[PDB]
Design a protein around this nucleic acid. Structure first.
Ligand SMILES: [Mg+2]
Ligand SMILES: [Mg+2]
Ligand SMILES: [Mg+2]
Ligand SMILES: [Mg+2]
Ligand SMILES: [Mg+2]
Length: 1185
RNA sequence: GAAUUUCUACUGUUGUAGAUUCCUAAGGCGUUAC
DNA sequence: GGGGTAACGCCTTAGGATAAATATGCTAG
DNA sequence: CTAGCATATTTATCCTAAGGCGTTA
């Protein structure tokens, strides 16, 4: 248990943000409201967003004005051209290093073009907002007084923009990051530009095409060196306009490839370049008024001729029989499908008649057909299934008038239900009449002379009903848009650098202190006018009650704070560095990155740094205990030691009366850092974040720091989102929800208000902390994990997690020998208290979501439940692994995803893997002792830090990822796998395929058949041994999938019985006991071969699935060389019981193979954890172990 | 019709059990119903 | 499996999680 | 003319250690 993971603690540091609630104390809120800080901070946030937009426009203008004067050398361009398109060749140094060199050359050229502009000097400084942005706005043609006023509001709040300016600094960088202009222009636009150039050259040179060759500026006439003008946003925009879309160069090719219908012509479609970085109802009354207006417009009062669209349209449709059918047009869209379904009951009669009798080429597909042509086609449609003579007569007109009047005879008609019903009826009528409506004009010709008396009225009548679609769009935009809003406003309390640091020296500039009284922590944000109130404390006497202010001391960055302080202009005369030390620092001989490294020079510099630290008045109080200077391989170790030992927290008693006077006078804004575990009523185990916060200041933790209090915290303000409430009244019993609780009625002495935290305005507080403050260097622990697994072989179990069809998640824990130790479905979780059948309520929420989205009142959710269900599975996995000494093997959803039809989709399982990785990065137990492996101060770290879904490979510490190929269709016994593919419809090939069978004989004993073959004949890849697949398994058949009497269904069929009933029809004798291999070569009767192959597909695949009950098993058709065939129903408690545990068991077996591979290999740090199909299949069929 | 830094399941009784890394910025992709 | 559209969702990446030196506004003069 | 204080704004700049391919559910 604890010994296997005892060494994997304190490996790498993590940074996590703790969130609390700030309860105002005393007169804090009164003074805040009196000074109007909340409204001013809301206005400040609005102004901040507007100034962000203005600065973004300034940056766009700077980019446009700077990249129009860049001139690429050109010599490197052709070098990149030849390197990129010199075929695949081999992944050698010339393929990678030279490519990186030329890419870096181009990026440096672009960055040099960037830095040459004068604006770049003061682009991320106060000079921008103070004098460059106002000048730019003045020179702006449109600008406005509002823009200048918003900019001038931030005249002194320049330090508020430091984060935004550091975000903007990434764009003008030559690094390999994806947030850089140069990186984009080199890695995304230019490669696609080269591809487009080559493909256009090939297309032009190969041969002329049907479309015009664009011969009749233009990128075609000027293509070489055009990329130099593509760099600017305007240049690439004009390029994309020329090529994309308006007639473009590739528009003709797109029009012509559809004529070709060729894959080799579809690909030449030229891809567009990526855009440049930084480039570009009211209420229910109105809805009711609009509904009433539409109702008045539709029905009105039958004044000034019949304007009622409801009845005039019906009369016009009924009169279609009298009107000539040679000029009435009909849509070729799904309206034809609906007409066919309504008239005959089959939605394919009319289309089949049109495609088989009207004409037979590309059938001259036209948008609109003719009523006369449809009638002629339907008058003779080969009569697939109908009466000998059909009284269709004017079938189209008869159906039209029928659906117009005799459908229901109820066409004429604040609550949504009535409005929704009326709208749905109107849309049904409009969709019914849509096929008779003409869309646009000049649609593939046709549109000859029409019936004036009918179409002239129809076009005028349909325009009134055409207003529903914009009305529907407005309705769906307004009425469908959850009860609460998690919108918060950042509070600064008039301080730009608020909470930026906790240090004692910076507490007057950051105006934030941390107090603590009787186990409750408080946050004091002094008024900016009175920021020096925590420096003149009269006394720290203990006789009266006192708070406990925090004395926070830090040396954040050693490599920066040491040279900055020791070599500054105002301190270099104090520490007095010798000329040798100055020369050493200037030359860079101390830096290992530099080429002039000298160990003695670095050691001399470190000795000088130690002497200066002992000279410093503030830093000599850190109690720095340094290892001997001769043991530093480089200054990096000294910096690590300085950073580790440079952190101290002490608490100073300050009189409570003084703090209360400060709060009352308005000089201090006292908030209580709150969390429901700080309540005087809380009695159970607290949250993990509560434990971390309490351990931040624990004396045991402060003895050797593990958790560190970070700076740059934030205070937010969230308003109320739910005015009305849903309160459970006091002294009124409430029905319990869980169906396993022994108690059904719960009565409380107090009110319980649903979403109480969203009905009142709440302050917030986001505290960053650093766990494992002294974890030296181990971010990739795979080297230690494999080295440990190489030695302790008969101690480590394996855990396999699979996402099944009947179970949300399944887990199987197998020993190192192979036999299962513990298997359990994870669709239900069993804690120390009531168990949640997460499978059930997930399906209930799935049903409720569609029910709500269908009628009205959509709340969705579901995703949070599925992402809150895995939060318990993750804890279960962690506890099981810690208490069973097991590695975790899971599916690899990058290189091998499984199919669909799973309760946990691919994207949800990816988040489950991410959350498991995140939980295993710092795994504490809420019950273990602090100084115990796995406790609060000795957390397990069994997984590398998360970087990306693709950054993690086939191992993430103690986690392993294996391909999910052939994991659910193999035997726990000797591993027969269905590698067959009958592939019928080729009569000639069936005889050859069946010829390769070694022996097809009837076994009178044991009642089943016997198929003998070898996997060398089929599946040309030579692997495995001779198999003896029998006909004892796979007794579930699906008849068909569509309609009725051939819908998805399950019928229990005895495969031997079907064998006998198929063989007796052709006198293939089998009772003699001899083989029938030389009996099927009789040819003829392709239906017999089809049925035989369909039955063969029903006798060699193990999984038998049903669409109804939980009936599911993996009964196998092969022998276990012992006299029995594996069946999931007869579970041995050591083989997967259900049909879903097979996948988990085989993933655990893949993990066992990974363990064995690690054991055999003696080349750690380069182990090959990728298991291919061949070696996996060999491993499963262990035969003689 | 159920309390929460926040989420999920709760009533475990002004709360129970387990996840919980927050802010800012850039870009790419995808049902859809227009 | 469908002709030149964005409200909405998903994904990727990047920066930070700082104290102290230094320049500037304001009072004093 | 102007020493001193308070406040806002730019500044200082390590080193490791990487990471890949078996097709198919
Ligand atoms: Mg400040
Ligand atoms: Mg709790
Ligand atoms: Mg699976
Ligand atoms: Mg809580
Ligand atoms: Mg809830």
């Amino acid at each position: 248990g604890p010994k296997m993971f005892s060494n994997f603690t304190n490996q790498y540091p993590l940074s996590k943000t703790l969130r609390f609630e700030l309860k105002p104390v005393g007169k804090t809120l009164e003074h805040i409201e009196k000074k109007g800080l909340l409204e001013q901070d809301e206005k400040r946030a609005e102004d901040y967003k507007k100034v962000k937009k203005i600065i973004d426009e300034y940056h766009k203008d700077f980019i446009e004005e700077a990249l129009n004067n860049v001139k690429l050398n050109g010599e490197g361009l052709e070098e990149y051209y030849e390197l990129y398109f010199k075929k695949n060749k081999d992944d050698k140094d010339k393929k990678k290093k030279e490519f990186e060199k030329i890419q870096d050359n181009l990026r440096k050229q672009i960055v040099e073009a960037f830095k040459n502009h004068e604006k770049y000097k003061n682009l991320f400084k106060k000079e921008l907002i103070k004098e460059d942005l106002p000048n730019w706005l003045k020179n702006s043609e449109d600008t406005g007084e509002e823009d200048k006023e918003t900019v001038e509001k931030f005249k002194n709040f320049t330090t508020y923009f430091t984060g935004f300016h550091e975000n903007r600094k990434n764009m003008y960088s030559d690094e390999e990051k994806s947030t850089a202009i140069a990186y984009r222009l080199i890695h995304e636009n230019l490669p696609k530009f080269l591809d487009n150039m080559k493909v256009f050259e090939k297309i032009k040179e190969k041969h002329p095409e049907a479309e015009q060759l664009e011969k009749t500026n233009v990128e075609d006439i000027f293509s070489l060196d055009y990329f130099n003008h593509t760099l600017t946003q305007s240049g690439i925009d004009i390029y994309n306009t020329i090529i994309g879309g308006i007639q473009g160069l590739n528009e003709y090719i797109n029009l012509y490839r559809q004529k070709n219908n060729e894959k080799n012509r579809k690909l030449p479609k030229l891809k567009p370049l990526y855009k440049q970085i930084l480039s570009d109802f009211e209420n229910d009354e109105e809805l009711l008024e609009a509904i009433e207006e539409f109702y008045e417009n539709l029905n009105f009062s039958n004044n000034n001729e019949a304007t009622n669209v409801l009845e005039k349209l019906k009369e016009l449709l009924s009169n279609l029989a009298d009107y000539d059918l040679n000029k009435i047009y009909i849509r070729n869209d799904t309206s034809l499908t609906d007409i066919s379904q309504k008239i005959f009951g089959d939605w394919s009669v009319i289309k089949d008649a049109l495609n088989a009798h009207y004409d037979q080429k590309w059938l001259k597909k036209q948008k609109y057909f003719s009523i006369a042509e449809l009638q002629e086609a339907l008058d003779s449609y080969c009569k697939e299934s109908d009466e000998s003579k059909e009284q269709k007569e004017n079938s189209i007109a008869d159906y039209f008038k029928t659906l117009a009047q005799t459908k229901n005879e109820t066409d004429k008609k604040k609550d949504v239900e009535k409005i929704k019903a009326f709208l749905d009826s109107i849309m049904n009528l409009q969709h019914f009449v849509k096929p008779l409506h003409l869309v646009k004009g000049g649609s593939a010709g046709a549109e000859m002379e029409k019936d004036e008396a009918f179409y002239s009225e129809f076009e005028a009548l349909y325009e009134e009903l055409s207003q529903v679609i914009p009305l529907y769009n407005k309705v769906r935009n307004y009425l469908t848009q959850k009860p609460y809003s998690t919108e918060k406003i950042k509070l600064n309390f008039e301080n730009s650098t608020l909470l930026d640091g906790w240090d004692v020296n910076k507490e007057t500039d950051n105006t934030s202190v941390l107090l603590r009284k009787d186990g409750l922590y408080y946050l004091g944000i002094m008024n900016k006018k009175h920021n020096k109130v925590f420096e003149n404390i009269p006394e720290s006497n203990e006789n009266d009650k006192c708070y406990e202010k925090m004395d926070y001391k830090l040396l954040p960055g050693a490599n920066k704070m040491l040279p900055k302080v020791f070599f500054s202009n105002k301190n270099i005369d104090y520490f007095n560095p010798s000329a040798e030390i100055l020369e050493i620092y200037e030359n860079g001989t101390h830096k290992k990155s530099g080429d002039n490294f000298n160990l003695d020079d670095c050691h001399k510099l470190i000795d000088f740094f130690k002497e200066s630290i002992n000279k410093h008045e503030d830093w000599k109080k850190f109690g720095f205990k340094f290892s001997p200077t001769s043991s530093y391989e480089d200054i990096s170790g000294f910096y690590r030691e300085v950073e580790q030992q440079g952190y101290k927290i002490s608490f100073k008693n300050i009189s409570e009366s003084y703090i209360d006077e400060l709060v009352d006078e308005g000089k201090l804004y006292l908030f209580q850092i709150y969390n429901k575990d700080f309540s005087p009523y809380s009695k159970g185990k607290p949250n993990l974040h509560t434990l971390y916060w309490k351990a931040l200041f624990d004396e045991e933790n402060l003895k050797d720091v593990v958790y560190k209090l970070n700076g740059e915290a934030e205070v937010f303000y969230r308003k109320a989102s739910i005015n009305e409430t849903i309160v459970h009244k006091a002294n009124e019993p409430i029905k319990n929800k869980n169906p396993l609780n022994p108690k059904k009625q719960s009565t409380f002495e107090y009110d319980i208000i649903k979403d109480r935290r969203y009905t009142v305005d709440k302050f917030q507080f986001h505290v960053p902390i650093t766990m494992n403050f002294k974890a030296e260097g181990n971010s990739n622990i795979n080297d230690e994990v494999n080295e440990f697994l190489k030695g302790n072989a008969p101690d480590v179990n394996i855990i396999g997690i699979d996402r099944g069809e009947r179970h949300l998640l399944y887990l199987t824990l197998i020993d190192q020998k192979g036999k299962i130790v513990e298997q359990d479905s994870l669709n239900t979780i069993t804690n120390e208290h009531n168990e949640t059948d997460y499978h059930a309520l997930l399906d209930d929420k799935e049903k409720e979501r569609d029910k709500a989205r269908k009628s009205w009142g959509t709340i969705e959710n579901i995703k949070e439940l599925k992402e809150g269900y895995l939060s318990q599975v993750v804890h279960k996995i962690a506890k099981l692994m810690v208490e069973h000494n097991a590695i975790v093997v899971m599916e690899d959803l990058n290189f091998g995803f499984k199919r669909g039809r799973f309760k946990v989709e691919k994207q949800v399982y990816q988040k489950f893997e991410k959350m498991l990785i995140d939980k295993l990065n710092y795994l504490v137990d809420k019950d273990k002792e602090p100084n115990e492996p796995g406790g609060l101060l000795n957390a397990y770290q069994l997984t590398n830090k998360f970087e990306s879904f693709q950054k993690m490979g086939k191992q993430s510490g103690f986690l392993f990822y294996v391909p999910a190929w052939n994991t659910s269709k193999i035997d726990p016994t000797t591993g027969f796998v269905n590698l067959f593919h009958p592939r019928y419809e080729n009569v000639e090939k069936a005889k050859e395929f069946f010829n390769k069978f070694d022996s097809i004989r009837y076994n009178s004993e044991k009642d089943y058949f016997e198929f003998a073959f070898d996997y060398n004949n089929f599946t040309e890849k030579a692997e495995g041994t001779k198999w003896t697949v029998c006909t004892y398994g796979e007794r579930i058949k699906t008849y068909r999938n569509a309609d009725k009497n051939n819908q998805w269904d399950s019928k229990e069929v005895n495969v031997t019985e079907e064998f006998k009933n198929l063989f007796d029809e052709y006198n293939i004798d089998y009772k003699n006991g001899n083989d029938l291999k030389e009996a099927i070569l009789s040819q003829d009767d392709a239906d017999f071969f089809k049925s035989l192959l369909h039955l063969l597909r029903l006798t060699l695949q193990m999984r038998n699935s049903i669409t109804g009950t939980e009936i599911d098993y993996i009964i196998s058709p092969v022998a276990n060389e012992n006299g029995e065939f594996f069946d999931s129903r007869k579970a041995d408690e050591s083989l997967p019981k259900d049909a879903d545990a097979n996948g988990a068991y085989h993933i655990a077996r893949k993990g066992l193979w990974v363990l064995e591979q690690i054991k055999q290999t003696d080349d750690l740090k380069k182990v090959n954890l990728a298991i291919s199909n061949k070696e996996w299949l060999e491993f499963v069929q262990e035969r003689k172990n």
